Amino acid sequence: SWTDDLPLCHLSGVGSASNRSYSADGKGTESHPPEDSWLKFRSENNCFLYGVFNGYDGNRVTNFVAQRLSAELLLGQLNAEHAEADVRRVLLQAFDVVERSFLESIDDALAEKASLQSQLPEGVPQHQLPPQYQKILERLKTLEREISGGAMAVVAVLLNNKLYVANVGTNRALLCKSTVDGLQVTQLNVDHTTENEDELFRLSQLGLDAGKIKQVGIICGQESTRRIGDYKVKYGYTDIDLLSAAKSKPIIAEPEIHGAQPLDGVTGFLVLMSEGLYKALEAAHGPGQANQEIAAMIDTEFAKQTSLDAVAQAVVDRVKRIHSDTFASGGERARFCPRHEDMTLLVRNFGYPLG
Numbered sequence: 001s002w003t004d005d006l007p008l009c010h011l012s013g014v015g016s017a018s019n020r021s022y023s024a025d026g027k028g029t030e031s032h033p034p035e036d037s038w039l040k041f042r043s044e045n046n047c048f049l050y051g052v053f054n055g056y057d058g059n060r061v062t063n064f065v066a067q068r069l070s071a072e073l074l075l076g077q078l079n080a081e082h083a084e085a086d087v088r089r090v091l092l093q094a095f096d097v098v099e100r101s102f103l104e105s106i107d108d109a110l111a112e113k114a115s116l117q118s119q120l121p122e123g124v125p126q127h128q129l130p131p132q133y134q135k136i137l138e139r140l141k142t143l144e145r146e147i148s149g150g151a152m153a154v155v156a157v158l159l160n161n162k163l164y165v166a167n168v169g170t171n172r173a174l175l176c177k178s179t180v181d182g183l184q185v186t187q188l189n190v191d192h193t194t195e196n197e198d199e200l201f202r203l204s205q206l207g208l209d210a211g212k213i214k215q216v217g218i219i220c221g222q223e224s225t226r227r228i229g230d231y232k233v234k235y236g237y238t239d240i241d242l243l244s245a246a247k248s249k250p251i252i253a254e255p256e257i258h259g260a261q262p263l264d265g266v267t268g269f270l271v272l273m274s275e276g277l278y279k280a281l282e283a284a285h286g287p288g289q290a291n292q293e294i295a296a297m298i299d300t301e302f303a304k305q306t307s308l309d310a311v312a313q314a315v316v317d318r319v320k321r322i323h324s325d326t327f328a329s330g331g332e333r334a335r336f337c338p339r340h341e342d343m344t345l346l347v348r349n350f351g352y353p354l355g
Contacts, residue, residue, distance in 0.1 A: 013308025
């Protein structure tokens with residue numbers, strides 16, 4: 001890739017771990033291929049790009065997004081002179097192009113799929129479909145993998161000490177400021193879910209019954225109400241009860257862009273993390289505990305570790321043992337930790353002391 005080619009940011013570190021399901025007769029785990037990803041890039045005249053992505057239904061979309069977002073932001077589209085309004089524009093455009101070009105990229109395969117299904121008798125067994133139809137089924141399996149996938153993303157750009165955050169979904173960005181009273185933690189973006197009132201509003205404005213969706217709180221295995229890709233919800237929502245009423249795409253790919261944070265004289269760090277990381281902590285420790293806890297865990301590791309990568313990885317490791325132990329013991333919460341998802345934690349340092 002042309003991504004694999006240039007400047008990594010030395011002021012950031014990443015830690016990660018793959019999804020895991022704990023074995024029934026406990027001693028061993030199971031994992032599906034990981035679907036998280038990230039990026040930490042520094043381009044000319046000091047503008048930085050960081051992102052953490054959470055995919056589902058394969059990792060093709062998370063890679064497509066990482067790759068394309070880069071292409072749309074690090075080849076000159078940016079330069080610290082633009083000022084908020086412009087940078088927001090550029091971010092909004094980069095996300096639009098990523099979504100559109102992604103949908104365009106699977107159009108052919110979609111048509112070929114329709115054409116193959118047309119040749120297949122419907123509602124007939126995985127098996128017991130004359131072997132004559134097997135070559136078709138296979139080709140359909142191959143296309144399904146090509147077209148499948150969705151991804152949530154949280155991206156942050158650093159344009160001349162001003163920090164911008166673009167978010168689509170439920171990954172999170174936390175600004176951890178070291179003061180004199182301790183560490184102040186503020187989540188820069190908002191989780192796009194049924195619990196998000198503004199998202200619930202948007203959804204009702206489309207003709208969906210907010211009441212029922214708010215109650216179920218999850219749309220086809222995913223909580224995020226904003227996602228990139230996923231042909232299933234972008235095109236077949238009318239065919240999904242919970243959304244069947246939408247008069248417009250209920251799940252959108254538009255990013256919510258946040259403020260513009262000044263970083264002159266601030267000391268601390270930025271955290272970008274995937275949904276699997278915090279959902280594992282809260283599954284072990286309970287509702288709403290994650291931001292504070294993770295920031296503290298990171299604070300702690302900052303004193304021991306010798307790299308930002310070790311810092312981030314130590315925290316990820318800590319969260320999985322907490323989760324693993326919780327399941328392993330059996331005191332209530334165990335029922336909540338039968339498995340966990342991919343975890344990614346990127347830390348961008350802002351003068352905070354490192355061991």
